[PDB]
Design an enzyme around this catalytic site. Sequence first.
Site, PDB file in Angstrom:
ATOM      1  N   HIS A   1      -5.993  -6.719  -2.622  1.00  0.00           N
ATOM      2  CA  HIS A   1      -5.181  -5.623  -1.675  1.00  0.00           C
ATOM      3  C   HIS A   1      -5.546  -5.895  -0.512  1.00  0.00           C
ATOM      4  O   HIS A   1      -6.260  -5.102   0.147  1.00  0.00           O
ATOM      5  CB  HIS A   1      -5.562  -4.215  -2.138  1.00  0.00           C
ATOM      6  CG  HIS A   1      -5.486  -3.940  -3.566  1.00  0.00           C
ATOM      7  ND1 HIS A   1      -4.386  -3.861  -4.522  1.00  0.00           N
ATOM      8  CD2 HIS A   1      -6.733  -3.584  -4.497  1.00  0.00           C
ATOM      9  CE1 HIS A   1      -4.591  -3.481  -5.515  1.00  0.00           C
ATOM     10  NE2 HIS A   1      -5.995  -3.363  -5.619  1.00  0.00           N
TER      11      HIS A   1
ATOM     12  N   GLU B   1     -10.792   1.293  -8.714  1.00  0.00           N
ATOM     13  CA  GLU B   1      -9.984  -0.257  -9.504  1.00  0.00           C
ATOM     14  C   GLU B   1      -9.629   0.212 -10.798  1.00  0.00           C
ATOM     15  O   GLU B   1      -8.656  -0.253 -11.397  1.00  0.00           O
ATOM     16  CB  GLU B   1     -11.190  -1.182  -9.418  1.00  0.00           C
ATOM     17  CG  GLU B   1     -10.513  -2.366 -10.033  1.00  0.00           C
ATOM     18  CD  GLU B   1     -11.535  -3.640  -9.652  1.00  0.00           C
ATOM     19  OE1 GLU B   1     -12.651  -3.726  -9.659  1.00  0.00           O
ATOM     20  OE2 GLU B   1     -10.594  -4.898  -9.618  1.00  0.00           O
TER      21      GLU B   1
ATOM     22  N   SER C   1       0.911  -1.125   0.034  1.00  0.00           N
ATOM     23  CA  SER C   1      -0.028   0.034   0.041  1.00  0.00           C
ATOM     24  C   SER C   1       0.964   1.196   0.067  1.00  0.00           C
ATOM     25  O   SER C   1       1.700   1.230  -0.781  1.00  0.00           O
ATOM     26  CB  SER C   1      -0.910   0.072   1.205  1.00  0.00           C
ATOM     27  OG  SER C   1      -1.978   1.195   1.310  1.00  0.00           O
TER      28      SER C   1
END
Length: 283
Positions: free
Chosen positions: A261, A229, A125
């Site tokens: 994710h 997305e 991330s």
Amino acid sequence: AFSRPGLPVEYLQVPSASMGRDIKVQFQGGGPHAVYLLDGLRAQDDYNGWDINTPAFEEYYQSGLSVIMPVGGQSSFYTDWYQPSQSNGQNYTYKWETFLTREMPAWLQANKGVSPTGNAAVGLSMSGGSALILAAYYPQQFPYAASLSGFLNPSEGWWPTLIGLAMNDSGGYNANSMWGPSSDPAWKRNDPMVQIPRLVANNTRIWVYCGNGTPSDLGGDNIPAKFLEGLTLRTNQTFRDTYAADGGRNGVFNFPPNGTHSWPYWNEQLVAMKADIQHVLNG
């Protein structure tokens, strides 16, 4: 993290002169070269997210690699900030690039015998891009970098806005205090896409995981999931294509349809890359 009994995980206090405080570091020794496991956007001050959510330490036990989990740095992007975060009362300036590239490796070399050179940076991330940027500017320290669901083009299009909103949602941190307004050179300096020529020139071994489905840590931006997305897919595809076009030839790009994710698939990737890191760093 539900480790089996008998594992030698330590918790260390490493002074940071640049931040004027001690940084907690979780550590597992196992060899002179290390995997630096960087945390996500909502990094806590007690334990690194890898240890909260995964069996990373046990997976890398007796791998021939040390494992370093720095603790703290919520919304920091593991970067050196321009100033203390404006609005949330932060009373010092984040200098996490200085800590990771100078202060912490000096301490670990003097006290643990961990080599300051020949390591791997692994981020997810928030820190996926950080890992690539660390390898871009410090190739001797990081010949290997992995980005798991990272922000690969933070200076472009929607990303400065989305990152700013995410940082505010994660502790009220201010992206302007970090890298300036999105027009400031710091945004491009710290953009993995923009620094692809460095990754190519360095012959950095890069491992890039692109997840599917709802992105992580963007939960507070009031924008439809499918739009986020779409942005993510487009940026990831552009990164991969640009790496190839710029002469990149030392990359692994993983885009499994059912990958997400999330910590479970970030762990899946961490396990998948173990043999890769072992061969690249230790022969």
